[PDB]
């Protein structure tokens, strides 16, 4: 029902190149490829898509004044208008707004150090129907704005780069027990 701290989610656009409903999702490789790329997931039965390197976990949610209190130097629910940490669930690196380009749009990629203004991303409702301070349910359509550059997390044409222009971002969660099977797991196969 709700998106709470430390709930593993994805990030997922829809892009149309001559009526494509190609629901490409935000992937990040890590490990020698710092930049982010797109993992197209609308051929989800034609291609059983690589979903290991696409999941992100909300490490910590804070309002903007709380982020300034942190820059003066636990499952809470998050609200619209808050600046969140997006860890990459696999590589452990935090998603940040890099200072590199490949016009005026910075590249979107991973990093290690949680400090600074680059790791954090402010959320915005993409609606007049939904507004500031109220909760973010499962399946909403939101906007991620960087804190450092104050650029939107823009979908170029198919790069992903932090630019001045909006793009919707849908959030469908992945997970939220001990000794029990959970999808996406990696296991060995004992016989007897």
């Amino acid at each position: 029902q709700f998106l709470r701290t430390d709930d593993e989610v994805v990030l997922q656009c829809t892009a149309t190149i001559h009526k494509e409903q190609q629901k490409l999702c935000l992937a990040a490789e890590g490990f020698g490829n710092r930049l982010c790329f797109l993992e197209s997931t609308s051929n989800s039965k034609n291609v059983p898509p690589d979903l290991s390197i696409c999941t992100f976990v909300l490490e910590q949610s804070l309002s903007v004044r709380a982020l300034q209190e942190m820059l003066a130097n636990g499952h809470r629910t998050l609200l619209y208008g808050h600046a969140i940490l997006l860890r990459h669930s696999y590589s452990g690196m935090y998603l940040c707004c890099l200072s590199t380009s490949r016009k005026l749009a910075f590249d979107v990629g991973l990093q290690e150090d949680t400090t600074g203004e680059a790791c954090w991303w402010t959320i915005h409702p993409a609606s007049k129907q939904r507004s500031e301070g109220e909760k973010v349910r499962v399946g909403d359509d939101l906007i991620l704005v960087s804190v450092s550059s104050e650029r939107y997390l823009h979908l170029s044409y198919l790069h992903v780069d932090a630019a001045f222009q909006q793009t919707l971002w849908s959030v469908a969660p992945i997970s939220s027990a001990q000794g029990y099977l959970i999808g996406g797991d990696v296991l060995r196969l004992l016989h007897g």
Binding site: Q68, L71, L104, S148, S149, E150
Partner: peptide, 30 residues
């Protein structure tokens, strides 16, 4: 380190990216 002043100044860096010197020098003869 004011925070907001630094950020804004970086946004002012990010556009007109210091290749402005051609538009400086090419005036000084004409």
């Amino acid at each position: 380190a004011k925070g907001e002043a630094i950020r804004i100044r970086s946004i002012l860096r990010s556009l007109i990216p210091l290749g402005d010197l051609v538009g400086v020098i090419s005036i000084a003869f004409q």
